[PDB]
Nucleic acid binder design. Structure first.
Length: 139
DNA sequence: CGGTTACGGT
């Protein structure tokens, strides 16, 4: 395995990356994260700063990806991963939604076939240094 | 195998 920047991922592959969590949304069916590493991907949604009433404060344009967490991923993260946390996501699956946008999915995997995981990354870990340096450019 | 659209703020 190896890590990718978000600018480097493509649909229908397995990948791993470090990212900052911008937004979380829990539902009765799953847990959703919106994450960024401040690199651009042509298949990300172009987030608009002109929206009336959004709590989104950036990044704007094609800089964030939605991650849908199911089952044990959902139950583990839903009361744990917070807006602002840094995460490392390993061996997650990518797909394209019905409108053509890249999305990341963590399906239940009782059978431990894929060694898929998400964990919180301490803010001071040097692995996060490029994320922080790129974030400055947009800040 | 789910769930839909960049909000909502549960």
């Amino acid at each position: 395995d190896s890590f990718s920047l978000l600018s480097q991922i493509t649909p229908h592959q397995r990948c791993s990356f470090y990212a900052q969590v911008i937004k979380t949304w829990y539902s009765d069916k799953n847990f959703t994260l919106y994450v960024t590493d401040y690199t651009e991907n042509e298949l990300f949604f172009p987030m608009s700063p002109y929206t009336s009433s959004s709590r989104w404060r950036g990044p704007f344009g094609r800089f964030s990806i939605r991650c849908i967490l199911w089952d044990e991923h959902d139950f583990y993260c839903r009361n744990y991963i917070k807006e602002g946390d840094y995460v490392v996501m390993k061996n997650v699956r990518t797909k394209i939604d019905h409108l053509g946008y890249l999305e990341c999915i963590l399906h239940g995997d009782s059978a431990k076939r894929y060694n898929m995981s998400i964990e919180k990354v301490d803010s001071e870990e040097p692995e996060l240094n490029e994320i922080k340096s790129r974030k400055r450019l947009y800040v």
